C-alpha cells in the first residue's frame, strides 16, 4: 500500500505521511486500522527510527506521533544509551529538556496535551537513571530553581520527581542491578532535604489546585521510603489532616498519604510522637464528620448511588481507618478524652461494613478479625467495644455467605463470628433467635434470608457450652419445623427442610449425645433420598456422609435399648434406601458406610460388615464375570459396560474410606478384575482397528476405557493406603504389571491411558524399594514410547506429559538403580527428557523436571568416585550447566528461576568442592593438570560470549567470578543471577556491579 512509505529510510521521513498512518490506527477501524498497526510497529522497531525522533517532536502536529517518537527514544535510552557517541547522549538530553520547557511555557499545550507531557517526563526520567547525578550534578538544584519561575513548570517538576521516586524506589528491584539501585536510592536520599523544602513550601503557600494535587501525589511516593522525621518534625501532618481534607480536589490523595503515614517506621517510646499520631487521626475524623458525612450517614446507600468519586472515597476511608486502627488503636484506648474518637472511628467502619461490595467487605472483615482476636486475648479491652461488637454480630449474620454446602469468605466470617460469640454468647443467641422470628412472622422471609441465617447459626457450633447449645439447638430446630409446616409448595418446604438438615449437620456434639434424635435424623434423610424434587437427594446424601464422618462411633456400637449396631440396619435396607438415587449418590452412600465400618476394630466383625455392604455389587459382579467370560461380545452392550463401571466405582468409593481395611474385598474381585481389564483392552484395540482412531471418541470405547480407568484408580487407591506391603508385593504387583504394562506399550498413542502412569507412580512410591525388577519392567514398557508421544511439541498428550515426569521423579527417588541398568542410549534419552522438561512453561512439568535434575545430580554424587559417576560428568555435566543457563536467561521461564538457580548452584559447587574426580575436558584442549575450576570458568566464559555477544569480556569474567565465589550462598547467588539478567538486556553494563555483595 501507500502507507508503507514511512518504512523506507533512504528517503526523508514525510511527517504528514506518518500522521496519516497514526490517525488511521488510532481513529480508524477494520482493515485500514489493522494495516496501519503493522506499519507503525515496523516503524518503531527500526533500530534507526530514534534518529528521526527529533524531527517528529519538532515538526509533527499529532500528539500520538510524538508519543510514539518518545517510545522509540525510550527503547534507545533503556537498552543502547551507553553505546552511543557522547555527542548524541548530550544532544538527546538537550532536546528532551527543551521540549518539556516549551510545552510548559505554552499554557494551551500544558492543559491539552497532558499525555504527551507525561510521556516526555518519563523519558527524561530514563535519562536521569543513566546520567544522574554523576553526569548531571546540578539537576535537582536547577529543578528547584526553575520551579519558582512558573506554576506550570513547578507542577510538571512534581510529576518528574514522582516518576523518579517510582523508578528508583518502587520499580527498581526487577529492572536495575543491585548496585545501580543503591546508587540512585542514595543519590535521591542525599538531595531529598532540598526536594522536601520545595514540596512543603508549595503545600503551605500554593493556591493552584492542580499544583497542590501534583505535589501531594509526589508526597505519596516519598512516604514509601523517606525518614519519619520529615513527617513528624514539620507541620505537614497538620496540613494533611486539616486543610487538604476540606477540599475534595486534595481529599483523595491526602487520605492516601495519611494511610501511608500510618505505616511509617516510628519510634514507639516517644510520647510526643504518640500525641502527633493521635492528633492527625483526630483532625482527619473531624474533617470527615463536618465536611463529608456524619457518622450516622447511610454509607451503604451512598456507595450504591455511585455519585462522582464516592465509591473510591469510601474505599480509601476504609483503608485509612483499618490501617491506622490496626497499628494505633491502643493509643486511643486508655485516655478517656479519646474514647469518643475511638468509637466514632469504629462506628464509621460499622457503616462501611454494610456496603454491598464483596472486596471492600473483605477489607473491613480483615480488620474486624484483627480486633475481635485482640479482644479475646488482651485483658480489660472487650468492654470498650461492646456496642461496636453488638452491631458487628448483626452485620456478619446478615451477610453470611454460602459455606461449601466464597468458601474463603465464609471461613473468614465464621472466624470473626466465633470470636464474637465467645465475647458475648448471650447477645449472639438473642440476635439469632430474633432473626428467626422475623423469618416466621414473614417480615423478612425469603429463600436467601433463611439460608443466610441458617449458615450463621451453623457457623458458631462449638462456642456455646453443651447445655446452652442444647437449649439453643432445640429452639432453632423447633422454630424451623414450624416454619416448614407453615409454608406451602415444594419449593419453599424444600428450602426450609434443607436448612434444617444443614443446621443439624453442623452440631455433631448434640447428635452424639441424643442418639434417639440422631436416629430420627438419618431416617428422615433416607426418606428424602426418594424425593424427586431437584436438589433434595443430593442434600440428603451430603448430609448423611457429613454426619457419619463426625459421629461414626455411634453407628458402630450397639446403643442402649437397640437390638443391633445401626450400621447393620443401614446395610440391611440399603437396596430400598438407595433405589431412587443416581449412581454418583449411591457411591457416596456406600463410602459413608465404609467410614462407619472402619471404626469397627475387631477384624472378623469388620470383614463381615464389609462383605455384607458389598453384597449387592458383588452379586452383580459375579453374574457379569460369569456372563462376559462366556460371551465377550456382551461387553459391547453399553448397558453391561455402565453396570460394570458402577460396580467398580462402588469399590473405589468404599476403598477410599476404608483404605487398608478394604483388602478382603479387593481379594474377592482382584483376579477376575484384571482379567476383565484384559478383555476390555482387547475390545478397545479391536474397535480402533475396525473403525480408526475416531473410535476413541465413541460412547462405546469411552465406556470401555472408563472400566479400565476405574480399575486402575481402585488399585491405586488401595496401594496408596495399604499397611501390609508384603501382600502388595507378593499378591498384587505381579498380576497388575502383567495386566497393564504390555497393553500400554503396544497400543497406539491415542489409546494409551495416562492413568497407567499415575497408577505406576503409586506402586513405585509405596513398594518401589521392594521390586527392583518390577521398576525396570515399568521403565521398559512406558519410558521410550511415552517420551516419543510428548517430545514433538509442548501441547499434545497433556496428561501423559504430567504423569510421565511424576513417574520418573519417584523412580529417581526410590529406585535409582533402574536408571543405572538402562543401556547408555536410553540413559541419554533420560537426560534429554529432563532437559525437555526444563523448557516447558507448564508448571507441573517444569518443576518436576528441575527436581529430577537436582535429585539425579545428588544420586550421582552419592555414588562416589566410580566409573558410572565419572562417565556421567564427562557426558552430561556441561549439558546440564548450559541447559540450565539457557532457561535462566531466555526470558520465557521466569516461573522457575529459584529452582534453576538452585540446580545451577549445585552444579557449580561440585567443581569448586572438587567432588568431580576426573577432568571435565579432553586430552588435547587444555594442558595437563588444569583444574576443573579453571576449565569450568573457561567453558562458561566462552558459552556466554557466544550467547550474549554484546557483553564485554570484563562483564562475563566479573559475573563468573562473583557467581563462583557465591555458590554456597543461595540468596546472594540469586542476586548475582538477577543482576546478570538485567545487564544482558542492555549494552555497557558496569562489571563492578557484580562486586555488590562484596
Amino acid at each position: 500500500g501507500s502507507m508503507e512509505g514511512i518504512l523506507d529510510f533512504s528517503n526523508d521521513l514525510d511527517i504528514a505521511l506518518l500522521d496519516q498512518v497514526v490517525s488511521t490506527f488510532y481513529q480508524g477501524s477494520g482493515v485500514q486500522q489493522k494495516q496501519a498497526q503493522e506499519i507503525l510497529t515496523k516503524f518503531q522497531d527500526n533500530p534507526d527510527a530514534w534518529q528521526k525522533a527529533d524531527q517528529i517532536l519538532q515538526f509533527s502536529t499529532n500528539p500520538q506521533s510524538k508519543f510514539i517518537a518518545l517510545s522509540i527514544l525510550d527503547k534507545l535510552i533503556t537498552r543502547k544509551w551507553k553505546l552511543l557517541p557522547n555527542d548524541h547522549r548530550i544532544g538527546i538530553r538537550n532536546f528532551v529538556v527543551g521540549m518539556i520547557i516549551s510545552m510548559c511555557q505554552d499554557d494551551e499545550v500544558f492543559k491539552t496535551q497532558k499525555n504527551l507531557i507525561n510521556k516526555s517526563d518519563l523519558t527524561l526520567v530514563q535519562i536521569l537513571k543513566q546520567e544522574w547525578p554523576q553526569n548531571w550534578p546540578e539537576f535537582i538544584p536547577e529543578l528547584i530553581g526553575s520551579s519558582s519561575s512558573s506554576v506550570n513548570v513547578c507542577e510538571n517538576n512534581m510529576i518528574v520527581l514522582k516518576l523518579l521516586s517510582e523508578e528508583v524506589f518502587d520499580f527498581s528491584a526487577e529492572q536495575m542491578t543491585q548496585a545501580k539501585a543503591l546508587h540512585l536510592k542514595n543519590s535521591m536520599s542525599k538531595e531529598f532535604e532540598q526536594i522536601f523544602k520545595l514540596c512543603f513550601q508549595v503545600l503551605e503557600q500554593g493556591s493552584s489546585s492542580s499544583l497542590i494535587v501534583a505535589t501531594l501525589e509526589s508526597l505519596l511516593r516519598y512516604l514509601h521510603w523517606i525518614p519519619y522525621r520529615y513527617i513528624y518534625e514539620t507541620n505537614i501532618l497538620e496540613l494533611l489532616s486539616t486543610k487538604f481534607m476540606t477540599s475534595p480536589d486534595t481529599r483523595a490523595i491526602t487520605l492516601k498519604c495519611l494511610t501511608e503515614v500510618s505505616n511509617l517506621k516510628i519510634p514507639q517510646d516517644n510520647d510526643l510522637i504518640k500525641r502527633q499520631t493521635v492528633l492527625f487521626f483526630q483532625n482527619t475524623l473531624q474533617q470527615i464528620a463536618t465536611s463529608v458525612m456524619p457518622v450516622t450517614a447511610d454509607l451503604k446507600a451512598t456507595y450504591a448511588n455511585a455519585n462522582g468519586n464516592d465509591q473510591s472515597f469510601l474505599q480509601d476511608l476504609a483503608m485509612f481507618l483499618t490501617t491506622y486502627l490496626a497499628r494505633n488503636r491502643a493509643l486511643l484506648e486508655s485516655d478517656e478524652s479519646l474514647r469518643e474518637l475511638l468509637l466514632n472511628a469504629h462506628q464509621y467502619l460499622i457503616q462501611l461494613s454494610k456496603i454491598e461490595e464483596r472486596e471492600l467487605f473483605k477489607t473491613t472483615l480483615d480488620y474486624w478479625h484483627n480486633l475481635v482476636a485482640d479482644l479475646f486475648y488482651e485483658p480489660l479491652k472487650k468492654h470498650i467495644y461492646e456496642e461496636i461488637c453488638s452491631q458487628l454480630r448483626l452485620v456478619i449474620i446478615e451477610n453470611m455467605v454460602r459455606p461449601e454446602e466464597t468458601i474463603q469468605l465464609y471461613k473468614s466470617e465464621r472466624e470473626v463470628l466465633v470470636y464474637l460469640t465467645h465475647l458475648n454468647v448471650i447477645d449472639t443467641e438473642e440476635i439469632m433467635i430474633s432473626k428467626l422470628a422475623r423469618q416466621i412472622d414473614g417480615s423478612e422471609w425469603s429463600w436467601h434470608n433463611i439460608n443466610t441465617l441458617s449458615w450463621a447459626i451453623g457457623s458458631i457450633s462449638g462456642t456455646m457450652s453443651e447445655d446452652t447449645e442444647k437449649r439453643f439447638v432445640v429452639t432453632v430446630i423447633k422454630d424451623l419445623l414450624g416454619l416448614c409446616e407453615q409454608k406451602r409448595g415444594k419449593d419453599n418446604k424444600a428450602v426450609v427442610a434443607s436448612d434444617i438438615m444443614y443446621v443439624v449437620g453442623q452440631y455433631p456434639r448434640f447428635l452424639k449425645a441424643h442418639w434417639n434424635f440422631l436416629r430420627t435424623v438419618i431416617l428422615k434423610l433416607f426418606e428424602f433420598m426418594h424425593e424427586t424434587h431437584e436438589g433434595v437427594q443430593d442434600m440428603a446424601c451430603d448430609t448423611f456422609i457429613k454426619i457419619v464422618q463426625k459421629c461414626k462411633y455411634h453407628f458402630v456400637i450397639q446403643q442402649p435399648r437397640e437390638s443391633e449396631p445401626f450400621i447393620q440396619t443401614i446395610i440391611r435396607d440399603i437396596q430400598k434406601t438407595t433405589a431412587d438415587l443416581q449412581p454418583q449418590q449411591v457411591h457416596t452412600f456406600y463410602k459413608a458406610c465404609g467410614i462407619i465400618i472402619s471404626e469397627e476394630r475387631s477384624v472378623a466383625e469388620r470383614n463381615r460388615l464389609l462383605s455384607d455392604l458389598m453384597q449387592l455389587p458383588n452379586m452383580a459382579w459375579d453374574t457379569i464375570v460369569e456372563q462376559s467370560t462366556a460371551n465377550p461380545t456382551l461387553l459391547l452392550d453399553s448397558e453391561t459396560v455402565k453396570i460394570i463401571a458402577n460396580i467398580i466405582k462402588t469399590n473405589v468409593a468404599v476403598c477410599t474410606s476404608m483404605g487398608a481395611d478394604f483388602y478382603p474385598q479387593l481379594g474377592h474381585i482382584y483376579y477376575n478384575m484384571l482379567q476383565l481389564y484384559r478383555a476390555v483392552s482387547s475390545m478397545i484395540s479391536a474397535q480402533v482397528a475396525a473403525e480408526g482412531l475416531i473410535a476413541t471418541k465413541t460412547p462405546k470405547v469411552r465406556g470401555l476405557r472408563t472400566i479400565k480407568k476405574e480399575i486402575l484408580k481402585l488399585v491405586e487407591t488401595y496401594i496408596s493406603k495399604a499397611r501390609n506391603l508384603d501382600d502388595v508385593v507378593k499378591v498384587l504387583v505381579e498380576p497388575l504389571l502383567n495386566a497393564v504394562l504390555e497393553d500400554y506399550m503396544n497400543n497406539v498413542p491415542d489409546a494409551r491411558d495416562a492413568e497407567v502412569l499415575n497408577c505406576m507412580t503409586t506402586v513405585v512410591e509405596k513398594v518401589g524399594h521392594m521390586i527392583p525388577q518390577g521398576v525396570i519392567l515399568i521403565l521398559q514398557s512406558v519410558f521410550e514410547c511415552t517420551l516419543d508421544m510428548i517430545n514433538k511439541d509442548f501441547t499434545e498428550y497433556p496428561e501423559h506429559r504430567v504423569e510421565f515426569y511424576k513417574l520418573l521423579k519417584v523412580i529417581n527417588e526410590k529406585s535409582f538403580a533402574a536408571f543405572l541398568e538402562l543401556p547408555p542410549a536410553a540413559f541419554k534419552l533420560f537426560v534429554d527428557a529432563i532437559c525437555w522438561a526444563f523448557k516447558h512453561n507448564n508448571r507441573d512439568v517444569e518443576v518436576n523436571g528441575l527436581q529430577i535434575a537436582l535429585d539425579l545430580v545428588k544420586n550421582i554424587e552419592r555414588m562416589g568416585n566410580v566409573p558410572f559417576a565419572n562417565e556421567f560428568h564427562k557426558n552430561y555435566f556441561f549439558i546440564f550447566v548450559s541447559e540450565t543457563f539457557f532457561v535462566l536467561t531466555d526470558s520465557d521461564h521466569k516461573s522457575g528461576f529459584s529452582k534453576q538457580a538452585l540446580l545451577l548452584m549445585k552444579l557449580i559447587s561440585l567443581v569448586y568442592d572438587n567432588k568431580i574426580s576426573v577432568p571435565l575436558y579432553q586430552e588435547a584442549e587444555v594442558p595437563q593438570g588444569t583444574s576443573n575450576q579453571v576449565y569450568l570458568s573457561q567453558y562458561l566464559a566462552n558459552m556466554l560470549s557466544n550467547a550474549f555477544p554484546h557483553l564485554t569480556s570484563e562483564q562475563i569474567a566479573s559475573f563468573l567470578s562473583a557467581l563462583t565465589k557465591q555458590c554456597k550462598d543461595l540468596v546472594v547467588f540469586k542476586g548475582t543471577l538477577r543482576d546478570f539478567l538485567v545487564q544482558i538486556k542492555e549494552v555497557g553494563g558496569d562489571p563492578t556491579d557484580y562486586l555488590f555483595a562484596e
Binding site: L481, C484, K493, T520, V521, K524
Partner: peptide, 9 residues
C-alpha cells in the same frame, strides 16, 4: 424434637 413429621407436601 418431632422431626419424624417433617414433610415436603
Amino acid at each position: 424434637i418431632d422431626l419424624s413429621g417433617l414433610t415436603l407436601q
